[PDB]
Write a protein that binds this ligand. Structure first.
Ligand SMILES: CC(C)[C@H](C(=O)O)[C@@H](O)C(=O)O
Ligand SMILES: CC(C)[C@H](C(=O)O)[C@@H](O)C(=O)O
Ligand SMILES: [Ca+2]
Ligand SMILES: [Ca+2]
Ligand SMILES: [Cl-]
Ligand SMILES: [Cl-]
Lengths: 364, 364
């Protein structure tokens, strides 16, 4: 029946790429007969300007009344001299994850055929391609562990954060990783620092416990310092990477940057009900905002992840994905995906959204 | 007068590259009139085989009686199924750092002229070159913070580690970073996660306090997830990177792997007295051990760092560095530094050590 989406476009290019995601969604709604209602709420920088804080009470409550959050990007110059701890990005994202128990972050990243040369990797390495799904635990570990704070003064003033994980928190993120590997290349690489951290000793232990239910999936463990090196040499050997909160933050962004094409990358953060927050992997790109230059594909693929994971509409989600593939192989590329001698073939944000939506309309 | 070095060659290629470092040191001792006595002690894997643990009491005591530790590499297949927490590398390295208060880790990494093509970076990026010094805080933060451990059972069993930093611990590592920038390109990039961690809020605060004493050095702050991406796009823009224990672990290894030439990279871990532990950046490479293939240059440059930082012998240290430069630009390269169509020009470990030592002898 009727789905309700909270739309939180945020700052920078958020609103302009959101417009294209909505246009594509409208074509999907028509093609598949879905009834989806959308309400927009302020978040991030615009919420600080309009309401005094990055996550107003009204926005939080509109997310509670929704089936999913279609989220843009938050932050920029204007607020980047507030304390790092009252800044819009951490002030929007961390309480949304904590409040809705969005323990699971999925970040699919691949080198697209024909775009290998944009990876900052050496040509013989990018030619091999890669397709790496990062599964990051999002509501535990050092981000929300207590005690957190500071005590004392002067030279002996100290600050502390506590990384904490229970077996239950580890096993539920690990099962997601194994379940995902099962449908891909059947390998989970679990990433920890078990030679140093008590949380990582438990992590590796519990991942090995969960593994018994997946005898068809290969499991390997790697230290985070070694994983950050190995992704530079053989990223084609990884399938699913399984990580705790802080190691996942670092590793998923390293992998994204390895694609050289962040404008194509989206992100799902979900709870066990399948309520989630769907966002592009990259930032608010405030210098390009309002110019029709931003690549909307990341925000469009966010909507496809939303349709799949929160709304259980697998066909709708894959239609959008294929409309994106069709754009990428039919010469519909924005300026950041072109070598600068070809930068004159660039499509605008609106041209991309129009093409993608017409492709869904035409039955792609 | 007479210096005393504890030699802890460890496992794998440790002993064979150590032999070359000692040969080079002998030439430096003759050229500069230094009296250096060396005693060897077991550490790591060989210590587990010979003494039941990775850091025997006799080894610890021989390090206490020395002016510096010239350290090889620990670990390998044979011990890699003990608990990650009784393994040789963490079992040797963490108690040595804690016992001697080796708070400062320096890892100099550069792309050497002529070896750019070995970097896993895209050719236009490696052509630009880079020279990045990582300064990592080594005895604080989450590695040695308490409470650390676990409690409970079953699903609610939990583990915890505590990241802790005081202003005094931050200011002494930061002054090292600023002092080092002052002699290089005069920029410190401090790396934290101040949007999430109480330790990082204090970190960034205190680094800004220390900065007042260095008005000639530029200071910028970057989040660790952003630093791991940016090193892939503009590593030539960084000079000194300043990091806490866990972020430094990750970032220094990412930078090392970016050079594509780990066999050239060394590491200094020092206390405030200038006692230190000097080691190659890479591992024990157990599959190549005993074959004369390993590149000894990392271990030779460890000895130069030892001469400079612990023994206050700047001239001796720079003679070794220049002997290494001469090798690299005179066709003296080991097999891993050659493109495989040139792998027939490879020098052995002994040929490299002989060349480098003769270069010091000849007055390089
Ligand atoms: C804004 C910050 C708290 C956040 C994180 O650390 O999770 C961001 O880096 C991300 O990856 O979503
Ligand atoms: C062995 C391990 C504890 C160690 C570290 O985390 O410091 C190693 O990764 C290093 O960089 O020296
Ligand atoms: Ca991040
Ligand atoms: Ca390391
Ligand atoms: Cl964590
Ligand atoms: Cl730390």
């Amino acid at each position: 029946s009727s789905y309700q989406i909270a739309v939180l476009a945020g700052d920078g290019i958020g609103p302009e790429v959101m417009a294209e995601a909505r246009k594509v969604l409208k074509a999907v709604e028509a093609r598949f007969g879905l009834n989806i209602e959308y309400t927009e709420y302020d978040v991030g920088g615009i919420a600080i300007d309009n309401h005094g804080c990055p996550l107003p009470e009204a926005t939080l409550k509109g997310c509670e009344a929704a089936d999913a959050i279609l989220f843009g990007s938050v932050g920029g110059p204007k607020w980047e001299k507030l304390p790092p701890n009252e800044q819009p990005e951490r002030g929007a994202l961390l309480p949304l994850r904590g409040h809705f128990e969005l323990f699971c972050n999925l970040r699919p990243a691949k080198l697209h055929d024909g775009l290998e040369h944009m990876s900052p990797l050496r040509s013989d390495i990018s030619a091999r391609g890669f397709d790496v799904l990062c599964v990051r635990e999002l509501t535990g570990g050092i981000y929300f562990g207590k005690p957190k704070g500071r005590q004392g003064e002067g030279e002996s003033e100290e600050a502390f954060d506590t990384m904490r994980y229970s077996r239950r928190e580890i096993s539920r993120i690990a099962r997601i990783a194994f379940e995902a590997a099962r449908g891909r290349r059947k390998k989970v690489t679990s990433v920890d620092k078990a030679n140093v951290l008590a949380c990582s000793v438990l992590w590796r232990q519990v991942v090995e416990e969960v593994a018994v239910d997946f005898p068809d999936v290969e499991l390997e463990h790697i230290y985070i310092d070694n994983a950050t090196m190995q992704l530079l040499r053989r990223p084609d050997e990884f399938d699913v990477m399984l990580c705790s909160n802080l190691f996942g933050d670092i590793l998923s962004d390293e992998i994204a940057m390895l694609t050289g094409s962040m404008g194509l990358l989206s992100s799902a953060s979900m709870n066990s009900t399948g309520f989630g927050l769907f966002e592009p992997a990259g930032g608010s790109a405030p210098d390009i905002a309002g110019k029709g230059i931003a690549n909307p594909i990341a925000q469009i693929l966010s909507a496809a992840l939303m349709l799949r994971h929160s709304l259980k509409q697998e066909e709708a989600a894959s239609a959008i994905e294929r409309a994106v593939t069709k754009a990428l192989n039919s010469g519909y590329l924005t300026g950041e995906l072109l070598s600068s001698d070809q930068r004159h073939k660039a499509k605008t944000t609106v041209q991309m959204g129009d093409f993608i939506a017409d492709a869904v309309k035409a039955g792609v």
